[PDB]
């Protein structure tokens, strides 16, 4: 994470992130719609931070500090670079859409009127196919990754030392190897919950209600295809 985005998403909601006089200028439905959008971006930020912990802290740490076969590290952290590139581009697009919506002279007061188009482009076409193929692979390799980590911790003492060091900071409390792997699997099932609650407060602009409805169906078609392509691997 970068301090700019950590501070921008430090607040518990959009109502507490924007200035109090700025909040007082808007309708209740606007405050509710923006609170759910802010959360979609907040959790997307946390999702990319999780994927960076897996790539730079755990994965890269095991390559430089340990004498493990590169095929073993690939089994512990499958498709993490592809997932990192996929969601980093999405977070990028969500963060730019927030900066375009920013009030001139302010760095925290914003109202996003268009989100649907951003989601339709992410959850459709070749971008969605890349993501569907990536998550079907990740989730089919998820068990073998948990089992491989557990075998390495119950045979190698230098791997045990490495895990105690990297995860020692309080920052990594809920973010160990196995927690990160499950964090990445549960992520795709969060989107229809977020987009449905966003859609619920987007009945002002009609093109926007249709965009969020089109994206909602796109996320469900995608989830159904990731679920259909899962086929658990064994050691």
């Amino acid at each position: 994470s970068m301090e700019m985005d950590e501070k921008d998403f430090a607040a518990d909601s959009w109502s507490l992130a924007v200035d109090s006089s700025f909040l007082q200028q808007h309708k209740k439905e606007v405050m509710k719609q923006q609170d759910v959008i802010y959360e979609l971006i907040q959790t997307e930020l946390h999702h990319v931070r999780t994927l960076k912990i897996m790539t730079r802290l755990f994965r890269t740490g095991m390559l430089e500090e340990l004498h493990l076969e590169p095929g073993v590290v690939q089994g512990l952290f499958p498709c993490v670079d592809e997932l990192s590139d996929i969601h980093t581009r999405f977070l990028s697009q969500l963060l730019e859409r927030r900066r375009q919506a920013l009030c001139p002279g302010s760095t925290r007061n914003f109202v996003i009127h268009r989100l649907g188009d951003l989601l339709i482009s992410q959850f459709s076409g070749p971008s969605a196919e890349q993501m569907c193929k990536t998550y079907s692979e990740f989730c089919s390799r998820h068990s073998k990754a948990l089992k491989l980590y557990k075998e390495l911790y119950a045979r190698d003492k230098r791997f045990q030392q490495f895990i105690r060091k990297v995860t020692r900071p309080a920052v990594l409390k809920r973010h160990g190897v196995q927690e990160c792997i499950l964090l990445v699997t549960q992520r795709i099932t969060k989107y229809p919950l977020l987009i449905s609650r966003i859609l619920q407060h987007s009945h002002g602009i009609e093109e926007e209600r249709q965009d969020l409805t089109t994206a909602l169906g796109l996320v469900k078609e995608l989830l159904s295809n990731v679920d259909e392509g899962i086929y658990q691997l064994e050691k």
């Binding site: 518990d12 909601s13 959009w14 109502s15 507490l16 609170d35 759910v36 959360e39 959790t43 946390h46 989730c139 998820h142 068990s143 948990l146 409390k173 809920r174 196995q178 927690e179 499950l182 964090l183 699997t185 549960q186 795709i188 099932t189 969060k190 229809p192 919950l193 977020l194 609650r197 989830l223 159904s224 990731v226 679920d227 259909e228 899962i230």
Partner: protein, 179 residues
Amino acid sequence: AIRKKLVIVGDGACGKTCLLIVFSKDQFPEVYVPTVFENYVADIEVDGKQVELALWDTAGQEDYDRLRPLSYPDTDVILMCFSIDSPDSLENIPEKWTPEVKHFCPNVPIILVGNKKDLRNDEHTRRELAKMKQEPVKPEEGRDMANRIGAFGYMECSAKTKDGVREVFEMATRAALQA
């Protein structure tokens, strides 16, 4: 401090997400009740034992039968949730949640939790249920279901008022420590 894993299972609007958020925050969200729960690691001291309790949620996974089982590995305690204002959610406990939880998690303590107990004396909740020829889930019905499915225990709570929330998670920690 021993690490133990908790997973909450149950139907869609049974309140499993609300419950986790209220426990992890300690209060009912004042300004914004979040939509989702990522994960949380709780420091609990039950009966003089210090435990690290990883809290997970299955909300969003209810329709994906090949994704959902990926939440179950290494579970030490299952909170089996149902809503007191929805007697239909209780009917699905022995038909859908119990066969699946017992298949992926053999020998894992299950605590049947009855969420939304405040709605048992709510006016609008009783009128709507009367149209469907029903009434809120009675304590004896929950106990009779926890007994029939072989649950470790039956507990009720309210995420809204926070009554009984601390006790469900403390009991879950005691249940996870059994071996």
